[PDB]
Amino acid sequence: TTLESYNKQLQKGQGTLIGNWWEERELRDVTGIGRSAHN
Amino acid sequence: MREIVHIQGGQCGNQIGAKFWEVISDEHGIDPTGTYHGDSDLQLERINVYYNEATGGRYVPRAILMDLEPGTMDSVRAGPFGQLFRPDNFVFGQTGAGNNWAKGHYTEGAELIDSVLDVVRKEAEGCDCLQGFQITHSLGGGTGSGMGTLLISKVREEYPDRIMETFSVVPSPKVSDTVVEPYNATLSVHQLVENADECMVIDNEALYDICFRTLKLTTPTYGDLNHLVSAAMSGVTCCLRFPGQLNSDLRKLAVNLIPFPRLHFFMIGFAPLTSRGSQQYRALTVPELTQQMFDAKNMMCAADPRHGRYLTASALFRGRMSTKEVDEQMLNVQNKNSSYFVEWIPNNIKSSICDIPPKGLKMAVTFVGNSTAIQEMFKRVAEQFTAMFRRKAFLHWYTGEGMDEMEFTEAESNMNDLVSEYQQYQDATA
Amino acid sequence: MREIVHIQGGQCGNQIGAKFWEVISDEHGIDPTGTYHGDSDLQLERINVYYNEATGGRYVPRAILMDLEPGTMDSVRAGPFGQLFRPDNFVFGQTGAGNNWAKGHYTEGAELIDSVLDVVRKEAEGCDCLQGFQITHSLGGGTGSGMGTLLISKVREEYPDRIMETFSVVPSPKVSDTVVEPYNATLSVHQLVENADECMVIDNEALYDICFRTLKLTTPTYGDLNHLVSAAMSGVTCCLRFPGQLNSDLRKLAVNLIPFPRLHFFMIGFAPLTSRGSQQYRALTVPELTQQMFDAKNMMCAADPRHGRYLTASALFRGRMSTKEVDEQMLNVQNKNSSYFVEWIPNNIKSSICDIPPKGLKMAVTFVGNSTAIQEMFKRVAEQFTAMFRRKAFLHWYTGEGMDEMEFTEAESNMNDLVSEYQQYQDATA
Amino acid sequence: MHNYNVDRKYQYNCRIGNWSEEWELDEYKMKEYLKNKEKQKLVSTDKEDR
Amino acid sequence: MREVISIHVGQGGIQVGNACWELFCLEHGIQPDGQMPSDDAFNTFFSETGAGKHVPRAVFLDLEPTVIDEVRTGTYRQLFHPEQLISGKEDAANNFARGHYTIGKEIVDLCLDRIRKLADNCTGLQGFLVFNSVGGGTGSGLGSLLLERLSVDYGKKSKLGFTIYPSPQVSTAVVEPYNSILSTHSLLEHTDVAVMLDNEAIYDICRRNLDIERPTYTNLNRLIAQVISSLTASLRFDGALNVDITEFQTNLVPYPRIHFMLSSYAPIISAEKAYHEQLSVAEITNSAFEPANMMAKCDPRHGKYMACSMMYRGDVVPKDVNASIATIKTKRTIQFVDWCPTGFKVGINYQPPTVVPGGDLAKVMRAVCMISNSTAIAEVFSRLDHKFDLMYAKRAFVHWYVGEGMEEGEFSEAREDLAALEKDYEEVGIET
């Protein structure tokens, strides 16, 4: 598991196409914060 | 995702990369500060192939800079897009090789290679999907010609199944900038033939003839030469980084261009090229693109492509166009010049189409050709080498650092056999 | 505030202290009228260490001058900065010593020491927490070598816990002044090993070679020798007077420099010393300081320190510097010269750092060392003593005031004794 | 081969030996004299003053 | 409601304490004047004066007045209580005998009175943290005697000792081994957990990472301050796995004799190389267990492991923590003792590390501080004992101690106790 890694913070768009990009995309679209809101 | 790591060594390779990375950066819309500012979403679509992301969203090239003297990187760091390069990857020597291949491959190299091999291992293991390696260097410079081929040997030792690509600036006798080219060039090529999956040769004199005749500009410069090389190289991997009608990656080219495991030396060309004064009259059409591509003088190598028969050819087009026109033009150029294609291999041209053209041009073409024409370069360098070696001039310097004439003899015999069996298939018939 | 007081006797000690007090007033910013016109607040928080405060806003040195002839005191009072010392601290005879130890230690010393003892006791009980004593004197004269050692014994039995430094100008055989020097030298030095906690030796011949080799001054005078002695002596107490990362007092020096109670003889040196020429032509860096400080010909003693082995050594760096560099220099210099350091004690070098460089300087080094080669001086002095004792020359001048050959015999016997136990550690192996 | 302290010695003007050191020492004496002129602390300038 | 008491004795102890208090007052937003600009997570280290300013729960001891008065003249002169900056009159002069048998009693009574009065105002005392340099006279003697007094006055309360031992080859004084073994013996039966704080390892780390060729004590003290802050951030900030100060004496000490520990921190990167790096959880965990990253000059590959405590701060995620620890366990170069199948305690805090202006460290989002108990630590005791007995064989410098009122036999039982300790360390490592 080497997720995150070569995909940093970005909002909207189709992304970078590495890792789980597809799965984070719909989460980010339906709700803000595709991955792990900052504390 | 089928990613490649950039490693460059020697002054020539450093200068080549200094503008190759600039071309990649402005094509992908990356500022010298590492912040993306492009307009098309396809720009970030496959940015993976050459970049890494650090915290804060900034991008860094996965290129490792190597040499035996720090002046080169001290110069290129102040240049444009010099801030992209990661400071840790810089590996430089303390003495210098002085264009002595034995020094650069046996004494200084055996000690220096540890850090560079460690860092390249780190880069390889960090990347998820490694496609292969690409290296830029010149066969006339000692430190490059030695330590680069040493790194070739070792990297191929731990990664036998991956593809590897070599960018060799082979010296021509007309424009000779150094005296000991025959020795270090033949020593480098002896090792390079055994371990190179792909090797493409570049001639500075051919570059200069192209820029003087086609571009018709009065004062050419190393900047323009580097720009030509960088554009040619971006053309190679545009198809791997952008969608198109028919994608064909590096392994695709390796399968479709190398008939026998040892004939893996190529000559390249780029199109279109027009002068600033005539650019408004030319109309960009596939027929004239192909006519310029298959021009003998447009090739970036000294070898006369009409002095031999093509083993195979490959053309990568960039931009939107009809593939039927491409195919019919390919058939026309094949059957019209059947004299210059060896007969026992029908349909010996690979054609690939990518839907994203270079910025500022609506269509572009890159050409890679495997032909018998390269034999004369090796014949002539062999003549220069034997002229050097009969009188044993400039030889005690090499042999005083662990070398002997046995290595020179075996290398020249190997390269002579290379030339002989390279020309063997030119006259072979079915 | 852990302060110390100064006692000096004889012409030599008078001159040494006279120039020392000028120096200390100089880097404390005190005018000859005793008024502070310094720039820092850092020159006032420790002013009580050396200067007492009086009415009118002025400061007075806590130094007491003793001798058998008022000529030297009349000269020093008329000399520059002579108004600092109070007239009450001058104790002088009206007869003199005549270079005879007996006159100064038995007849006139006993009857005169009462006043100096009273004044030193008064001034000592005046201060809050007295740190120790320091004496500057010469052993080749009568009045000094007698009254100084008598007062040392007296104050030692009076205050057993306090520490005492003495700065001893011993007679050099090469440059001689009197034909009776070794007698009173041996008689005085016989009484130091029981009282003085630290003795540090100085040779006028050594100072002459230093000034004529390194400083390269054509016609040096006693002012130069006195000034070098003053700078070297002042460098010791910088830690107790100024802030720094590693503070180290006289007691720390004693405990870290005394392996055994009867090995309290030291040899000292100063750096950087250089002639007028390269003073702005050479860079003052800690590697240069540590290279120059261990130089044998940099010594302020006629003893040549490369004929033996070091027991312990200590250096007191002044000015801002980095501790890691200091430690690595010390370690490297201890490693390259393992033959010159005794083996059964590890890490026999002490380093201290202070944040205030001297006047007109940015880095300075004061060195103290315990080495086995100092016994050469005692060998020569004992040889001369025995040689002119076997013929009983000039012994009547001594025996005419209650002295006998017996105490001479115990003196020379203890000399040979100390020589034996000081040389038998040279070859000691675990 | 140049050696110092050679018996009789002339002034700094000749080049017999150790001339550079003494000449630059004299030069620095003049330089500090200039400094004492620059900062108004000259005993003479006090003497004519009072 | 929960807070600790800070003790700084010795010149090194006070010089590191002053830096760590700089760091803490900077982190909690308190200016050097002592009042919050206003433009309950501080009770751990500061207490309200009733209206406005605050005072730290720390006391400083030293026999020579230089450091104490220079701090009194420093910029924090309005921060500390004027009467808790205790200074003596005469320096101990690297002599354990002076600091333990002659001059200590005249100050330790006032010190313990101060400690009592400080504890009286508090209600939730968690324990004591003590900072000293062992290879120094006043530091070793006063720290030893204070630990002895506290062990009988309070007893069960936890005490953590961040001691600076002499380095293996690089050292300043010559007589350091004597008071080193004496202080080690004294603290062996009175310090709950001891932390190694040598200097040569810190020099190596700063020279290789920060690329500093002229470091001074300031960088070392700032690194130690960062270590302390990362260790104690859990008590005052919210996190997924909050860990109390008492969660060391129950997790890292198999036997009462073995309580000496050595640490590490990550990341260690300057400001120009930070923006070009990954700084992922797996990489920062891997960089922690490398043997040149260990905060003390000792080889961990020469011995087993008994207990490891890793504290993460920032946006750390237990998924990544577990993945990294699984990779570490898979890795062969690090091995644990057989009788300890599980040997890690992990804590998580949400507060990212704070950055001091003008410091060498850069602003970093993820960081981990690691504490390790290893049987390989017996190497430093062995080398120190060898340096001891080499020059003790012929009774050098022993007069300086015997004449101060110290009996000559203490060295024998000190030697025997450290010898018993080293047999303990070598015996625990055997397989069952």
Ligand SMILES: Nc1nc2c(ncn2[C@@H]2O[C@H](COP(=O)(O)OP(=O)(O)OP(=O)(O)O)[C@@H](O)[C@H]2O)c(=O)[nH]1
């Ligand atoms: N890392 C580090 N160590 C220090 C520092 N200051 C002192 N030390 C250590 O302290 C040892 C010497 O003792 P000091 O701290 O100088 O003096 P002390 O502990 O007060 O004992 P005394 O000298 O008797 O007063 C040295 O070996 C250092 O290792 C510091 O600022 N940083």
Ligand SMILES: Nc1nc2c(ncn2[C@@H]2O[C@H](COP(=O)(O)OP(=O)(O)O)[C@@H](O)[C@H]2O)c(=O)[nH]1
């Ligand atoms: N394309 C290109 N070729 C160069 C450049 N600089 C030098 N060369 C070629 O490199 C050859 C000399 O190589 P050298 O500098 O000795 O290689 P090195 O020893 O590895 O530094 C010459 O024949 C030049 O034609 C450059 O900036 N661009």
Ligand SMILES: Nc1nc2c(ncn2[C@@H]2O[C@H](COP(=O)(O)OP(=O)(O)O)[C@@H](O)[C@H]2O)c(=O)[nH]1
């Ligand atoms: N360095 C230095 N040495 C001096 C000074 N005055 C005298 N001496 C040395 O002391 C020796 C004579 O000592 P003496 O005056 O008889 O000692 P006293 O009788 O105790 O005063 C001579 O050999 C000189 O070299 C001085 O001002 N500085």
Ligand SMILES: [Mg+2]
């Ligand atoms: Mg101290």
